[PDB]
């Protein structure tokens, strides 16, 4: 996957897939789905579905929610209050054992991030009266830091893969809906049909 601040964005449309098979499996640790009840995903039809994927630490799953606090929820990825989306998160401890030291996350920013903002940039963060230039030092810091994902750590340090699904409902066309099932046929009997 990608970094948390450079979260990966995917656009899916023009397909038919079953959303029920996701929560049916027991391998999904966290499923907080605010937009609609889990069993109604297949019932309703949507458009141009968007998926945002990243990796967070163990004890920050509560940060990913519409309209709450959090350092990651403020400088890395923030959900607007009017967000009828759906959130899945699952452990990936066995996929980063030694541990992994290639993960970066924003820690310092002037203000909170905008909704669905792909803010990619690098700069020496300054927090002092004196201007910051040249080499880093006092009041001149790097806003990106690594993760302590040691293979001998418990909850709070185990990497978690987090995906957020969002959508727009019937802007004008319809491309992706829930699957439909069909039964067998009968003959020589007065039947009410729905062909």
């Amino acid at each position: 996957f990608a970094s948390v601040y450079a979260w990966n964005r995917k656009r899916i449309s023009n397909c038919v897939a079953d959303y029920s098979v996701l929560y049916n499996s027991a391998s999904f640790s966290t499923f907080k789905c605010y937009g609609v009840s889990p069993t109604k995903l297949n019932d309703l039809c949507f458009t141009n579905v968007y998926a945002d994927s990243f990796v967070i630490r163990g004890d920050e799953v509560r940060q990913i929610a519409p309209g709450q606090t959090g350092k990651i929820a403020d400088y890395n990825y923030k959900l607007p209050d009017d967000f009828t989306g759906c959130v899945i998160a699952w452990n990936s401890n066995n996929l980063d054992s030694k541990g992994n030291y290639n993960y970066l996350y924003r820690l310092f920013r002037k203000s909170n991030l905008k909704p669905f903002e792909r803010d990619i940039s690098t700069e020496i963060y300054q927090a002092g009266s004196t201007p910051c230039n040249g080499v880093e030092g006092f009041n001149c810091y790097f806003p990106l830091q690594s993760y302590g994902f040691q293979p001998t750590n418990g909850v709070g340090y185990q990497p978690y893969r987090v995906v957020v699904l969002s959508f727009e409902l019937l802007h004008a066309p319809a491309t992706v809906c829930g699957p439909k099932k069909s039964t067998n046929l009968v003959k020589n009997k007065c039947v009410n049909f729905n062909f």
Partner: antibody
Amino acid sequence: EVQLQQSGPELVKPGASVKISCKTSGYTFTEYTIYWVKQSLGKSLEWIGGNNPNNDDTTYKQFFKGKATLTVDKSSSTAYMELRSLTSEDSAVYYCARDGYPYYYALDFWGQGTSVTVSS
Amino acid sequence: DIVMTQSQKFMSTSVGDRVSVTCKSSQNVGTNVAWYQQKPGQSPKALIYSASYRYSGVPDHFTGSGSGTDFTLTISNVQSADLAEYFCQQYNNYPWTFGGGTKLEIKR
């Protein structure tokens, strides 16, 4: 809503260690750094140094060796300075100040200062 | 290197004449200064920011200067509460160091 209460006058002995406390209350302490300066009875102002409450950073001037030490705590929300080698001329007043990053750079708020006098 | 003299240590104005003090600095390092008033006994009070701005909490009637490696400040007049010390500021490098200060005396 910014205020600063410091300690009173102190009498020190050469070749000893003393402590001076700068207390900050009524406002957030995590973001803005804390600066320390001296006044030797109306002479030129010397920037003793500065410290960062968040990163626990420490910065001195060009010539400060001898008592170069900084310390802060959030439970008491204050700062402690340790003075050593009070040989012959350190009798002066210490001033503890706080700056503002969004506005009012360069030591907007000051304190009453603590006067330390060296004697036998 | 690091030196601040502002070409004077103390200046005297008797009555009515406008007061102006420079803050000539060292070679080009930047453009950021300040001026503080030091009353005889209590904490310094900030007078001007970067030699040309205004203070919300101070009845500011002041005249400043431009930019570059030289700075100047002009105050309204010599009131009855102007006898104090004048301190200039220079915050570019971490080893902060100010000048010797300026003293305003009412020449009776």
